[PDB]
Amino acid sequence: RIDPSKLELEERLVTVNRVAKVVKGGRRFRFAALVVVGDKNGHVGFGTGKAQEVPEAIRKAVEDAKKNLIEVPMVGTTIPHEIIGRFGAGNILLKPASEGTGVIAGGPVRAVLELAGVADILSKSLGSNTPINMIRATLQGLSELKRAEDVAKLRGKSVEELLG
RNA sequence: GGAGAGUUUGAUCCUGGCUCAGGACGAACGCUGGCGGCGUGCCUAAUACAUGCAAGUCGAGCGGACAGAUGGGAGCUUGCU
């Protein structure tokens, strides 16, 4: 479903890109923005930020962030299993680990996983070093996650039978 | 038990290069330098070497030399032979 706006969003920015456009006179410098937005309890999202200024792009990032959020399973403050997302030439894989392992991730990706609350991820940016698509490389993989009690309900099977 | 970042462009994504942060040296150089353990210390020339030492041991394997004086005796200077 759609995640409601009845939460506590923390919304720290990642990068700012100044982005041009060439008219009869000369250039026109605007700014681009993207802000990873969420709580620390499993809801992550973002939106684009476009303006003619610095701070109003920060404002309009929050709108589509509250229009588009997504939820992640938090089994033991980890991802419950291993997955590899492949959206648009930026491959970023996701590996779970033990609870002491911290958050080892790429630059913009590290400002995503701490905005999940999930603190145990190994990852490695296989694909390109572009900030929009690396975040698209994360949530697309995080969308394809599964829960332990859910797939047993999908299989019509016991949850403990998935473990033993 | 797996971090990435600058760069082609007016601007964007890819693509693709190199660059960079890290870790080691039997390392050298520049500048400085108080000490203590533990460890290494000719990779090039297996090129040439002054000087000293680096493999001898058994007299219970053996002949002889080699000193020896336990005493014995000799010639006298009492110093010796």
Curated annotation (Swiss-Prot):
PROSITE patterns: RIBOSOMAL_S5 (PS00585), S5_DSRBD (PS50881)
Effect of residue 102 to R: In rpsE9; suppresses S12 mutation K55D. Lethal in the absence of the S12 mutation
Segments traversing the membrane: none
The organism of origin for this protein: Bacillus subtilis (strain 168)
GO biological process per UniProt: response to antibiotic; translation
HAMAP family registered for this protein in UniProt: Ribosomal_uS5_B
Additional remark text: Altered S5 proteins have been identified in a number of mutants. Some mutations in S5 have been shown to increase translational error frequencies.
Cleaved signal peptide residues: none
GO molecular function annotations of the record: rRNA binding; structural constituent of ribosome
Task performed by this protein: With S4 and S12 plays an important role in translational accuracy; many suppressors of streptomycin-dependent mutants of protein S12 are found in this protein, some but not all of which decrease translational accuracy (ram, ribosomal ambiguity mutations).
Domain of life: Bacteria
The family this protein is said to belong to: Belongs to the universal ribosomal protein uS5 family.
Protein name, UniProt field: Small ribosomal subunit protein uS5
Subunit structure: Part of the 30S ribosomal subunit. Contacts proteins S4 and S8.
Cellular compartments per GO CC: cytosolic small ribosomal subunit
Consequence when changing residue 26 to V: In rpsE1; spectinomycin restistant, not a ram mutant
Alphabetized NCBIfam families for the sequence: rpsE_bact
